[PDB]
Amino acid sequence: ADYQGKNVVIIGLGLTGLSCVDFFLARGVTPRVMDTRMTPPGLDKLPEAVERHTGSLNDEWLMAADLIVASPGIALAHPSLSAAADAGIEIVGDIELFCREAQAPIVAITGSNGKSTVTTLVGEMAKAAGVNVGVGGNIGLPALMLLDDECELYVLELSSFQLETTSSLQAVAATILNVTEDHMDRYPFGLQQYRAAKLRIYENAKVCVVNADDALTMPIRCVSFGVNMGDYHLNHQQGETWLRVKGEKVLNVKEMKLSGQHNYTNALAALALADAAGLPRASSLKALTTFTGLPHRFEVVLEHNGVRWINDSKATNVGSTEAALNGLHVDGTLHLLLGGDGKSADFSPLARYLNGDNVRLYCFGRDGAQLAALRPEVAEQTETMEQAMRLLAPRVQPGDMVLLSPACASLDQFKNFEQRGNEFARLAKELGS
Ligand SMILES: CC(=O)N[C@H]1[C@@H](OP(=O)(O)OP(=O)(O)OC[C@H]2O[C@@H](n3ccc(=O)[nH]c3=O)[C@H](O)[C@@H]2O)O[C@H](CO)[C@@H](O)[C@@H]1O[C@H](C)C(=O)N[C@@H](C)C(=O)O
Ligand SMILES: Nc1ncnc2c1ncn2[C@@H]1O[C@H](COP(=O)(O)OP(=O)(O)O)[C@@H](O)[C@H]1O
Protein backbone atom coordinates (compact mmCIF):
# COMPACT_ATOMS: atom_id res chain seq x y z
CA ALA A 1 0.00 0.00 0.00
CA ASP A 2 0.99 3.67 -0.40
CA TYR A 3 0.65 6.12 2.48
CA GLN A 4 2.59 8.98 0.86
CA GLY A 5 1.20 12.34 2.00
CA LYS A 6 -1.49 10.76 4.20
CA ASN A 7 -2.45 12.12 7.64
CA VAL A 8 -1.87 9.06 9.88
CA VAL A 9 -2.83 8.88 13.54
CA ILE A 10 -1.77 6.04 15.77
CA ILE A 11 -3.62 5.22 18.99
CA GLY A 12 -1.69 3.55 21.73
CA LEU A 13 1.90 3.83 22.83
CA GLY A 14 2.85 0.26 23.74
CA LEU A 15 4.80 -2.26 21.61
CA THR A 16 2.26 -2.07 18.81
CA GLY A 17 2.02 1.74 18.44
CA LEU A 18 5.82 1.97 18.40
CA SER A 19 6.18 -0.66 15.70
CA CYS A 20 3.62 1.38 13.74
CA VAL A 21 5.62 4.59 14.26
CA ASP A 22 8.72 2.81 12.97
CA PHE A 23 6.74 1.42 10.02
CA PHE A 24 5.49 4.84 8.87
CA LEU A 25 8.78 6.68 9.45
CA ALA A 26 10.64 4.06 7.36
CA ARG A 27 8.35 5.04 4.50
CA GLY A 28 8.94 8.77 5.11
CA VAL A 29 5.46 9.27 6.57
CA THR A 30 5.42 11.02 9.95
CA PRO A 31 2.41 9.85 11.97
CA ARG A 32 0.98 11.55 15.05
CA VAL A 33 0.43 9.41 18.13
CA MET A 34 -1.87 9.56 21.08
CA ASP A 35 -2.65 7.47 24.10
CA THR A 36 -5.34 7.79 26.79
CA ARG A 37 -2.69 7.32 29.49
CA MET A 38 -0.55 10.31 30.58
CA THR A 39 2.72 8.32 30.57
CA PRO A 40 2.19 5.18 28.47
CA PRO A 41 5.00 2.60 28.62
CA GLY A 42 6.35 3.27 25.08
CA LEU A 43 6.52 7.06 25.55
CA ASP A 44 10.29 7.05 26.30
CA LYS A 45 11.00 5.05 23.17
CA LEU A 46 9.34 7.47 20.78
CA PRO A 47 11.37 9.44 18.18
CA GLU A 48 11.62 13.11 19.07
CA ALA A 49 10.36 14.01 15.60
CA VAL A 50 6.91 12.59 16.37
CA GLU A 51 4.06 14.83 17.60
CA ARG A 52 2.20 13.21 20.47
CA HIS A 53 -0.84 13.69 22.68
CA THR A 54 -1.20 11.82 25.94
CA GLY A 55 -3.67 11.69 28.84
CA SER A 56 -6.68 11.46 26.49
CA LEU A 57 -7.50 11.02 22.82
CA ASN A 58 -7.26 14.05 20.53
CA ASP A 59 -10.55 14.08 18.65
CA GLU A 60 -9.48 16.87 16.25
CA TRP A 61 -6.44 14.81 15.37
CA LEU A 62 -8.67 11.77 14.90
CA MET A 63 -11.26 13.68 12.85
CA ALA A 64 -8.65 15.22 10.53
CA ALA A 65 -6.99 11.79 9.92
CA ASP A 66 -6.84 9.95 6.59
CA LEU A 67 -5.93 6.74 8.42
CA ILE A 68 -6.36 5.75 12.07
CA VAL A 69 -4.16 2.87 13.27
CA ALA A 70 -5.59 1.44 16.50
CA SER A 71 -3.51 -0.70 18.89
CA PRO A 72 -5.45 -3.86 20.03
CA GLY A 73 -5.54 -2.57 23.60
CA ILE A 74 -8.22 0.04 22.71
CA ALA A 75 -11.80 -1.00 21.77
CA LEU A 76 -13.19 -0.06 18.37
CA ALA A 77 -16.33 0.70 20.37
CA HIS A 78 -14.55 3.57 22.12
CA PRO A 79 -16.85 6.61 21.66
CA SER A 80 -13.98 8.52 19.96
CA LEU A 81 -13.40 5.69 17.47
CA SER A 82 -17.05 5.02 16.59
CA ALA A 83 -17.30 8.76 15.86
CA ALA A 84 -14.32 8.53 13.46
CA ALA A 85 -15.90 5.44 11.92
CA ASP A 86 -19.13 7.44 11.51
CA ALA A 87 -17.05 10.13 9.80
CA GLY A 88 -15.97 7.34 7.46
CA ILE A 89 -12.35 7.58 8.57
CA GLU A 90 -10.56 4.31 7.79
CA ILE A 91 -9.50 2.43 10.94
CA VAL A 92 -6.96 -0.41 10.78
CA GLY A 93 -4.53 -2.13 13.18
CA ASP A 94 -0.92 -3.28 12.84
CA ILE A 95 -1.90 -6.71 11.55
CA GLU A 96 -3.82 -5.10 8.71
CA LEU A 97 -0.82 -2.89 7.82
CA PHE A 98 1.26 -6.04 7.92
CA CYS A 99 -0.92 -8.18 5.63
CA ARG A 100 -0.82 -5.46 2.94
CA GLU A 101 2.97 -5.56 2.80
CA ALA A 102 3.72 -9.24 3.47
CA GLN A 103 5.33 -11.05 0.51
CA ALA A 104 5.30 -14.59 1.90
CA PRO A 105 2.45 -16.85 3.02
CA ILE A 106 0.91 -16.38 6.49
CA VAL A 107 -0.08 -19.06 8.94
CA ALA A 108 -2.55 -17.42 11.34
CA ILE A 109 -3.32 -18.81 14.85
CA THR A 110 -5.97 -17.75 17.37
CA GLY A 111 -8.06 -19.15 20.22
CA SER A 112 -8.54 -18.68 23.92
CA ASN A 113 -5.60 -20.94 25.05
CA GLY A 114 -2.69 -22.77 23.37
CA LYS A 115 -1.83 -19.95 20.92
CA SER A 116 1.80 -19.46 21.81
CA THR A 117 2.41 -23.22 22.05
CA VAL A 118 0.94 -23.83 18.62
CA THR A 119 2.55 -20.70 17.10
CA THR A 120 6.03 -21.73 18.45
CA LEU A 121 5.62 -25.27 17.29
CA VAL A 122 4.67 -24.29 13.70
CA GLY A 123 7.80 -22.11 13.75
CA GLU A 124 9.88 -25.05 14.88
CA MET A 125 8.43 -27.19 12.06
CA ALA A 126 9.37 -24.50 9.54
CA LYS A 127 12.86 -24.21 11.10
CA ALA A 128 13.35 -27.96 10.87
CA ALA A 129 12.66 -27.64 7.13
CA GLY A 130 15.38 -24.93 6.76
CA VAL A 131 12.73 -22.25 6.13
CA ASN A 132 13.44 -18.61 7.01
CA VAL A 133 10.28 -18.30 9.15
CA GLY A 134 9.12 -15.01 10.85
CA VAL A 135 7.18 -15.80 14.09
CA GLY A 136 5.41 -12.91 15.84
CA GLY A 137 2.14 -11.12 16.50
CA ASN A 138 0.32 -11.48 19.83
CA ILE A 139 3.02 -13.89 21.01
CA GLY A 140 4.98 -10.73 21.75
CA LEU A 141 7.06 -9.66 18.74
CA PRO A 142 4.96 -7.03 16.88
CA ALA A 143 4.25 -8.36 13.37
CA LEU A 144 5.44 -5.20 11.54
CA MET A 145 8.94 -5.87 12.84
CA LEU A 146 8.93 -9.27 11.06
CA LEU A 147 8.59 -7.71 7.63
CA ASP A 148 11.55 -8.92 5.67
CA ASP A 149 12.13 -9.51 1.97
CA GLU A 150 14.05 -12.71 2.87
CA CYS A 151 11.26 -14.17 5.02
CA GLU A 152 9.71 -17.23 3.31
CA LEU A 153 6.87 -17.95 5.77
CA TYR A 154 5.14 -15.85 8.47
CA VAL A 155 3.54 -17.50 11.49
CA LEU A 156 1.27 -14.99 13.32
CA GLU A 157 -0.42 -15.46 16.65
CA LEU A 158 -3.52 -13.30 16.60
CA SER A 159 -5.90 -12.06 19.38
CA SER A 160 -9.56 -11.34 18.89
CA PHE A 161 -8.65 -7.66 19.39
CA GLN A 162 -6.18 -7.73 16.46
CA LEU A 163 -8.63 -9.68 14.25
CA GLU A 164 -11.36 -7.05 14.79
CA THR A 165 -9.24 -4.39 12.99
CA THR A 166 -7.99 -6.71 10.24
CA SER A 167 -9.68 -7.07 6.85
CA SER A 168 -7.01 -8.21 4.33
CA LEU A 169 -5.67 -11.37 6.01
CA GLN A 170 -5.56 -14.22 3.47
CA ALA A 171 -3.78 -16.93 5.38
CA VAL A 172 -2.39 -19.99 3.62
CA ALA A 173 -3.67 -21.74 6.85
CA ALA A 174 -5.69 -20.45 9.81
CA THR A 175 -7.04 -21.94 13.05
CA ILE A 176 -9.10 -21.08 16.09
CA LEU A 177 -7.80 -23.60 18.57
CA ASN A 178 -10.72 -23.24 21.02
CA VAL A 179 -13.13 -20.69 22.45
CA THR A 180 -13.76 -20.22 26.17
CA GLU A 181 -14.87 -17.05 28.05
CA ASP A 182 -12.07 -14.45 28.00
CA HIS A 183 -11.59 -10.66 27.91
CA MET A 184 -15.29 -10.31 28.49
CA ASP A 185 -15.09 -6.60 29.33
CA ARG A 186 -14.25 -6.09 25.64
CA TYR A 187 -17.31 -8.18 24.52
CA PRO A 188 -20.47 -6.85 26.26
CA PHE A 189 -22.70 -8.87 23.92
CA GLY A 190 -21.22 -12.11 25.23
CA LEU A 191 -19.58 -15.34 24.07
CA GLN A 192 -20.86 -15.05 20.47
CA GLN A 193 -19.36 -11.54 19.97
CA TYR A 194 -15.99 -12.75 21.26
CA ARG A 195 -16.29 -15.81 18.96
CA ALA A 196 -17.32 -13.62 15.94
CA ALA A 197 -14.11 -11.61 16.25
CA LYS A 198 -12.12 -14.86 16.15
CA LEU A 199 -14.07 -16.25 13.15
CA ARG A 200 -12.67 -13.47 10.89
CA ILE A 201 -9.39 -15.35 10.85
CA TYR A 202 -10.89 -17.86 8.35
CA GLU A 203 -12.08 -15.34 5.79
CA ASN A 204 -10.14 -15.91 2.58
CA ALA A 205 -7.99 -18.49 4.33
CA LYS A 206 -6.85 -21.17 1.89
CA VAL A 207 -7.26 -23.93 4.54
CA CYS A 208 -9.27 -23.61 7.78
CA VAL A 209 -8.09 -25.85 10.57
CA VAL A 210 -10.91 -26.34 13.11
CA ASN A 211 -11.22 -28.12 16.39
CA ALA A 212 -13.57 -31.08 16.02
CA ASP A 213 -14.32 -31.01 19.76
CA ASP A 214 -15.22 -27.30 19.98
CA ALA A 215 -18.16 -26.16 17.75
CA LEU A 216 -17.32 -22.56 18.50
CA THR A 217 -14.17 -22.90 16.40
CA MET A 218 -16.19 -23.78 13.28
CA PRO A 219 -17.46 -21.37 10.68
CA ILE A 220 -21.23 -21.17 10.81
CA ARG A 221 -21.23 -21.89 7.04
CA CYS A 222 -12.01 -27.11 6.57
CA VAL A 223 -9.58 -29.64 8.00
CA SER A 224 -10.21 -30.77 11.60
CA PHE A 225 -8.14 -31.83 14.62
CA GLY A 226 -9.60 -33.71 17.58
CA VAL A 227 -9.04 -36.11 20.45
CA ASN A 228 -11.04 -39.11 19.07
CA MET A 229 -12.12 -37.87 15.63
CA GLY A 230 -11.14 -35.53 12.85
CA ASP A 231 -8.69 -35.46 9.95
CA TYR A 232 -5.93 -35.18 12.59
CA HIS A 233 -6.71 -37.14 15.72
CA LEU A 234 -5.37 -39.35 18.52
CA ASN A 235 -5.78 -43.10 18.41
CA HIS A 236 -5.32 -44.93 21.67
CA GLN A 237 -5.19 -48.73 21.23
CA GLN A 238 -3.18 -51.73 22.52
CA GLY A 239 -1.62 -49.51 25.23
CA GLU A 240 -0.26 -46.88 22.82
CA THR A 241 -1.37 -43.47 21.61
CA TRP A 242 -0.71 -42.47 17.98
CA LEU A 243 -1.08 -39.30 16.00
CA ARG A 244 -3.36 -40.16 13.08
CA VAL A 245 -3.56 -38.04 9.94
CA LYS A 246 -6.02 -38.87 7.19
CA GLY A 247 -6.28 -42.35 8.72
CA GLU A 248 -2.48 -42.96 8.71
CA LYS A 249 -0.37 -43.51 11.82
CA VAL A 250 2.25 -40.76 11.71
CA LEU A 251 3.91 -40.86 15.14
CA ASN A 252 3.77 -42.54 18.56
CA VAL A 253 3.19 -39.75 21.17
CA LYS A 254 6.07 -41.32 23.19
CA GLU A 255 8.40 -39.74 20.63
CA MET A 256 7.30 -36.23 21.67
CA LYS A 257 8.70 -34.29 24.59
CA LEU A 258 5.36 -32.58 25.29
CA SER A 259 2.91 -34.13 27.74
CA GLY A 260 -0.84 -33.77 28.21
CA GLN A 261 -3.60 -34.75 25.82
CA HIS A 262 -4.29 -31.09 25.00
CA ASN A 263 -0.62 -30.60 24.02
CA TYR A 264 -1.00 -33.65 21.77
CA THR A 265 -3.95 -31.98 20.07
CA ASN A 266 -1.87 -28.76 19.88
CA ALA A 267 0.73 -30.93 18.05
CA LEU A 268 -2.02 -32.10 15.65
CA ALA A 269 -3.21 -28.52 15.05
CA ALA A 270 0.36 -27.41 14.36
CA LEU A 271 0.91 -30.37 12.04
CA ALA A 272 -2.28 -29.53 10.18
CA LEU A 273 -1.21 -25.91 9.74
CA ALA A 274 2.28 -26.95 8.62
CA ASP A 275 0.89 -29.46 6.11
CA ALA A 276 -1.47 -26.81 4.68
CA ALA A 277 1.47 -24.39 4.42
CA GLY A 278 3.31 -26.99 2.24
CA LEU A 279 6.05 -27.73 4.78
CA PRO A 280 7.68 -31.14 4.32
CA ARG A 281 5.99 -33.75 6.53
CA ALA A 282 9.24 -35.46 7.64
CA SER A 283 10.72 -32.27 9.02
CA SER A 284 7.46 -31.30 10.77
CA LEU A 285 7.35 -34.68 12.50
CA LYS A 286 10.96 -34.14 13.46
CA ALA A 287 10.01 -30.81 15.16
CA LEU A 288 7.38 -32.76 17.12
CA THR A 289 10.12 -34.97 18.54
CA THR A 290 12.49 -32.12 19.50
CA PHE A 291 10.02 -29.44 20.75
CA THR A 292 10.20 -29.18 24.57
CA GLY A 293 7.21 -26.88 25.07
CA LEU A 294 7.04 -23.43 26.65
CA PRO A 295 7.88 -23.01 30.32
CA HIS A 296 4.92 -23.42 32.75
CA ARG A 297 2.54 -24.83 30.13
CA PHE A 298 1.60 -28.24 31.52
CA GLU A 299 5.36 -28.73 31.89
CA VAL A 300 6.59 -31.97 33.53
CA VAL A 301 9.19 -30.91 36.11
CA LEU A 302 9.94 -34.33 37.63
CA GLU A 303 8.98 -37.94 37.14
CA HIS A 304 10.21 -40.14 40.01
CA ASN A 305 8.97 -43.14 42.01
CA GLY A 306 6.04 -43.30 39.58
CA VAL A 307 4.84 -39.77 40.50
CA ARG A 308 4.63 -37.07 37.77
CA TRP A 309 5.00 -33.49 39.02
CA ILE A 310 3.47 -31.05 36.50
CA ASN A 311 3.95 -27.28 36.45
CA ASP A 312 0.91 -25.77 34.70
CA SER A 313 1.33 -22.39 36.39
CA LYS A 314 0.42 -20.64 33.14
CA ALA A 315 -3.14 -21.90 33.66
CA THR A 316 -4.47 -18.61 35.08
CA ASN A 317 -7.98 -19.12 33.80
CA VAL A 318 -10.69 -21.75 34.07
CA GLY A 319 -10.45 -22.89 30.36
CA SER A 320 -6.74 -23.86 30.67
CA THR A 321 -7.24 -25.92 33.84
CA GLU A 322 -10.36 -27.46 32.41
CA ALA A 323 -8.39 -28.63 29.32
CA ALA A 324 -5.71 -30.06 31.63
CA LEU A 325 -8.29 -32.00 33.71
CA ASN A 326 -10.24 -33.15 30.67
CA GLY A 327 -7.27 -34.94 29.18
CA LEU A 328 -6.03 -36.72 32.34
CA HIS A 329 -5.46 -40.47 32.54
CA VAL A 330 -4.01 -40.75 36.06
CA ASP A 331 -3.57 -44.33 37.31
CA GLY A 332 -3.42 -43.41 40.99
CA THR A 333 -4.45 -40.19 42.75
CA LEU A 334 -4.47 -36.71 41.31
CA HIS A 335 -3.21 -34.05 43.73
CA LEU A 336 -4.42 -30.80 42.32
CA LEU A 337 -3.17 -27.36 43.42
CA LEU A 338 -5.76 -24.56 42.91
CA GLY A 339 -5.93 -20.95 43.99
CA GLY A 340 -4.58 -17.44 43.94
CA ASP A 341 -6.51 -14.57 42.42
CA GLY A 342 -9.59 -16.07 40.71
CA LYS A 343 -10.53 -12.74 39.07
CA SER A 344 -14.23 -13.37 39.83
CA ALA A 345 -14.25 -16.45 37.52
CA ASP A 346 -16.92 -19.11 37.56
CA PHE A 347 -15.16 -22.29 38.67
CA SER A 348 -18.17 -24.67 38.08
CA PRO A 349 -16.84 -26.07 34.85
CA LEU A 350 -14.05 -27.75 36.87
CA ALA A 351 -16.34 -29.69 39.20
CA ARG A 352 -17.26 -32.52 36.81
CA TYR A 353 -13.59 -33.59 36.71
CA LEU A 354 -13.31 -33.69 40.48
CA ASN A 355 -15.61 -36.64 41.38
CA GLY A 356 -14.65 -40.19 42.29
CA ASP A 357 -12.25 -41.70 44.74
CA ASN A 358 -8.89 -40.57 43.39
CA VAL A 359 -8.73 -36.73 43.51
CA ARG A 360 -7.42 -34.43 46.23
CA LEU A 361 -7.58 -30.64 46.08
CA TYR A 362 -5.10 -28.40 47.83
CA CYS A 363 -6.42 -24.90 47.70
CA PHE A 364 -4.52 -21.79 48.62
CA GLY A 365 -4.14 -18.04 48.13
CA ARG A 366 -6.70 -15.23 48.08
CA ASP A 367 -9.60 -17.23 46.64
CA GLY A 368 -8.71 -20.72 47.87
CA ALA A 369 -12.06 -21.13 49.65
CA GLN A 370 -13.95 -20.68 46.37
CA LEU A 371 -11.85 -23.43 44.82
CA ALA A 372 -12.25 -25.73 47.85
CA ALA A 373 -15.99 -25.15 47.61
CA LEU A 374 -15.84 -27.17 44.38
CA ARG A 375 -15.67 -30.24 46.58
CA PRO A 376 -14.98 -29.57 50.29
CA GLU A 377 -14.85 -33.32 51.26
CA VAL A 378 -11.56 -33.79 49.44
CA ALA A 379 -10.05 -30.31 49.75
CA GLU A 380 -7.36 -28.89 52.05
CA GLN A 381 -7.00 -25.16 52.35
CA THR A 382 -3.75 -23.50 53.21
CA GLU A 383 -2.47 -19.94 53.03
CA THR A 384 0.38 -20.71 50.58
CA MET A 385 1.33 -23.06 47.76
CA GLU A 386 4.36 -24.22 49.80
CA GLN A 387 2.15 -25.27 52.66
CA ALA A 388 -0.09 -27.13 50.22
CA MET A 389 2.95 -28.98 48.79
CA ARG A 390 4.18 -29.99 52.25
CA LEU A 391 0.70 -31.35 53.01
CA LEU A 392 0.40 -33.39 49.80
CA ALA A 393 3.99 -34.65 49.47
CA PRO A 394 3.91 -37.18 52.35
CA ARG A 395 0.74 -38.60 50.75
CA VAL A 396 1.93 -39.23 47.17
CA GLN A 397 2.26 -42.82 45.99
CA PRO A 398 3.49 -44.45 42.73
CA GLY A 399 0.95 -43.75 39.97
CA ASP A 400 -0.11 -40.35 41.33
CA MET A 401 0.08 -36.96 39.67
CA VAL A 402 0.79 -33.68 41.39
CA LEU A 403 -0.64 -30.96 39.17
CA LEU A 404 -0.22 -27.22 39.68
CA SER A 405 -2.98 -25.87 37.41
CA PRO A 406 -4.44 -23.21 39.67
CA ALA A 407 -7.09 -21.71 37.37
CA CYS A 408 -6.17 -18.29 38.89
CA ALA A 409 -3.75 -15.42 38.54
CA SER A 410 -0.74 -15.53 40.84
CA LEU A 411 -0.56 -11.82 41.58
CA ASP A 412 -1.88 -11.97 45.16
CA GLN A 413 1.20 -13.93 46.36
CA PHE A 414 3.77 -14.01 43.56
CA LYS A 415 5.53 -11.62 41.21
CA ASN A 416 3.92 -13.47 38.27
CA PHE A 417 2.92 -16.97 37.12
CA GLU A 418 6.57 -17.73 36.31
CA GLN A 419 7.64 -17.27 39.92
CA ARG A 420 4.79 -19.49 41.04
CA GLY A 421 5.94 -22.18 38.51
CA ASN A 422 9.61 -21.91 39.44
CA GLU A 423 8.70 -22.12 43.13
CA PHE A 424 6.56 -25.18 42.40
CA ALA A 425 9.41 -26.80 40.44
CA ARG A 426 11.94 -26.25 43.26
CA LEU A 427 9.60 -27.73 45.87
CA ALA A 428 8.74 -30.62 43.59
CA LYS A 429 12.43 -31.61 43.22
CA GLU A 430 12.91 -31.27 47.00
CA LEU A 431 9.82 -33.27 47.96
CA GLY A 432 9.58 -35.67 44.97
CA SER A 433 13.16 -36.98 45.03
C1 LIG B 1 -3.61 -6.36 25.36
C2 LIG B 1 -2.92 -6.51 24.02
O1 LIG B 1 -3.60 -6.66 23.01
N1 LIG B 1 -1.57 -6.50 24.01
C3 LIG B 1 -0.80 -7.00 22.87
C4 LIG B 1 -0.15 -5.79 22.23
O2 LIG B 1 0.72 -5.19 23.20
P1 LIG B 1 0.83 -3.59 23.23
O3 LIG B 1 1.90 -3.28 24.26
O4 LIG B 1 0.93 -3.05 21.85
O5 LIG B 1 -0.59 -3.31 23.91
P2 LIG B 1 -1.54 -2.04 23.71
O6 LIG B 1 -2.41 -2.20 22.48
O7 LIG B 1 -0.74 -0.77 23.92
O8 LIG B 1 -2.46 -2.29 25.03
C5 LIG B 1 -1.80 -2.52 26.28
C6 LIG B 1 -2.63 -1.84 27.36
O9 LIG B 1 -2.50 -0.41 27.25
C7 LIG B 1 -3.77 0.19 27.52
N2 LIG B 1 -4.02 1.33 26.64
C8 LIG B 1 -3.68 1.31 25.34
C9 LIG B 1 -3.91 2.43 24.56
C10 LIG B 1 -4.48 3.57 25.16
O10 LIG B 1 -4.69 4.58 24.47
N3 LIG B 1 -4.80 3.59 26.46
C11 LIG B 1 -4.58 2.49 27.21
O11 LIG B 1 -4.87 2.49 28.42
C12 LIG B 1 -4.85 -0.88 27.46
O12 LIG B 1 -5.31 -1.03 28.80
C13 LIG B 1 -4.11 -2.17 27.17
O13 LIG B 1 -4.49 -3.11 28.16
O14 LIG B 1 0.62 -6.15 21.10
C14 LIG B 1 1.62 -7.14 21.32
C15 LIG B 1 2.22 -7.44 19.94
O15 LIG B 1 1.18 -7.75 18.97
C16 LIG B 1 1.02 -8.40 21.99
O16 LIG B 1 2.05 -9.31 22.35
C17 LIG B 1 0.28 -8.03 23.26
O17 LIG B 1 -0.34 -9.19 23.77
C18 LIG B 1 -0.31 -9.32 25.21
C19 LIG B 1 0.66 -10.44 25.63
C20 LIG B 1 -1.71 -9.68 25.63
O18 LIG B 1 -2.06 -9.64 26.79
N4 LIG B 1 -2.55 -10.02 24.66
C21 LIG B 1 -3.92 -10.42 24.93
C22 LIG B 1 -4.77 -9.96 23.74
C23 LIG B 1 -4.04 -11.92 25.16
O19 LIG B 1 -3.17 -12.73 24.68
O20 LIG B 1 -5.04 -12.33 25.81
N1 LIG C 1 -5.41 -26.35 23.35
C1 LIG C 1 -5.52 -25.93 24.63
N2 LIG C 1 -6.68 -25.80 25.30
C2 LIG C 1 -6.79 -25.33 26.55
N3 LIG C 1 -5.72 -24.99 27.29
C3 LIG C 1 -4.49 -25.08 26.71
C4 LIG C 1 -4.30 -25.57 25.35
N4 LIG C 1 -2.99 -25.55 25.05
C5 LIG C 1 -2.38 -25.13 26.16
N5 LIG C 1 -3.28 -24.84 27.14
C6 LIG C 1 -2.97 -24.28 28.50
O1 LIG C 1 -3.26 -22.88 28.42
C7 LIG C 1 -2.30 -22.07 29.13
C8 LIG C 1 -1.60 -21.12 28.13
O2 LIG C 1 -0.94 -21.86 27.08
P1 LIG C 1 -0.22 -21.03 25.86
O3 LIG C 1 0.26 -21.96 24.84
O4 LIG C 1 0.70 -20.01 26.55
O5 LIG C 1 -1.50 -20.23 25.31
P2 LIG C 1 -1.83 -18.71 25.01
O6 LIG C 1 -0.68 -18.23 24.13
O7 LIG C 1 -3.09 -18.81 24.21
O8 LIG C 1 -1.92 -17.95 26.30
C9 LIG C 1 -1.33 -23.09 29.77
O9 LIG C 1 -1.86 -23.50 31.04
C10 LIG C 1 -1.48 -24.28 28.82
O10 LIG C 1 -1.11 -25.55 29.36
Residue numbers in the entry: 1 to 221, 227 to 438
Give the original sentences from the paper that presented this experimental model.
MurD catalyzes the addition of D-glutamic acid to UDP-MurNAc-L-Ala, generating the dipeptide moiety L-Ala-D-Glu in almost all bacterial species. From a structural point of view, Mur ligases are three-domain enzymes that share a very well conserved ATP-binding site that harbors the Gly-X-X-Gly-Lys-Thr/Ser motif and display notable structural similarities in terms of domain arrangement. The N-terminal domain is involved in the binding of the UDP-precursor, the central domain in the binding of ATP, and the C-terminal domain in the binding of the amino acid or dipeptide. Crystal structures of Mur ligases reveal that MurC, MurD and MurF display at least two distinct conformations, namely ‘open’ and ‘closed’, with the position of C-terminal domain dictating the nature of the conformation.
